[PDB]
């Protein structure tokens, strides 16, 4: 099949997330503080994406200024040589972030700062799981409010999902699945799951 299901998406993400749990906690905290600043600055988001390339630079990586440099410091040794253990997962994250809007990046920044990644991660993951098959439009039964999320026009979870192309409503049905939202909803899930794995 062309597509994957949420099970396959989850499996794919977990190949990266599984070994983030063995990463040193002090690293992940510094990395998460750096990623917060990167998610708040589109330019640093692009600067970091270029510096890492895709992790295949044979030589040392030159240090950078600002948030991009803050993240980059966490991924290199004393020489500036990237540690694939740390760089590749960040590359995967940056790849998924390319599909999201700056509005979503800053919403993810707020989630990092307040350490509230599990909420949106479950809402996005549950919508992906209950929207099968993704190529079909479908009104959905899940009310995000009954998961403990603030739900309403302008709410973080609203804007986060509205930016993916979903058709949102104040009342039932709160969410209608749109096939065009597949890629951004999947990338959104991956970005949340990778960030959460670091937390």
Numbering used by the authors: 282 to 480
What does the paper say about this structure?
Gasdermin D (GSDMD) is the central executioner of pyroptosis, a proinflammatory type of cell death. The released N-terminal domain is sufficient to form pores in the plasma membrane, resulting in swelling and subsequent rupture of the cell.
Here, we report the crystal structure of the autoinhibitory C-terminal domain of GSDMD at 2.04 Å resolution to further analyse determinants of GSDMD activation. To obtain pure and soluble hGSDMD^Cterm^, the native hGSDMD caspase-1 cleavage motive _272_FLTD_275_, was replaced with a tobacco etch virus (TEV) protease cleavage site (ENLYFQ↓S, with cleavage occurring between Gln (Q) and Ser (S)) in the expression construct GSDMD^TEV^ ([Fig fig1]). In iterative cycles of manual model building and refinement, the model was refined to R-work/-free of 0.23/0.26 at a resolution of 2.04 Å in space group P2_1_2_1_2 ([Table tbl1]). GSDMD^Cterm^ adopts a compact all alpha-helical fold with ten alpha helices (α1- α10) and dimensions of 36.5 x 56.2 Å ([Fig fig2]). The N-terminal α1 and C-terminal α10 helices are aligned in antiparallel orientation and tightly interact via zipper-like hydrophobic interactions. The helices α2, α3 and α4 are connected by two long loops of fourteen and ten aa length, respectively, and form a helical bundle interacting with α5 and α6 ([Fig fig2]). In the crystal structure of hGSDMD^Cterm^, the four C-terminal linker residues (A282, F283, T284, E285) have been modelled but are already characterized by increased flexibility. The structural comparison between hGSDMD^Cterm^ and mGSDMA3^Cterm^ demonstrates conservation of the central binding groove of interface I, while interfaces II and III are not conserved between GSDMD and GSDMA3.
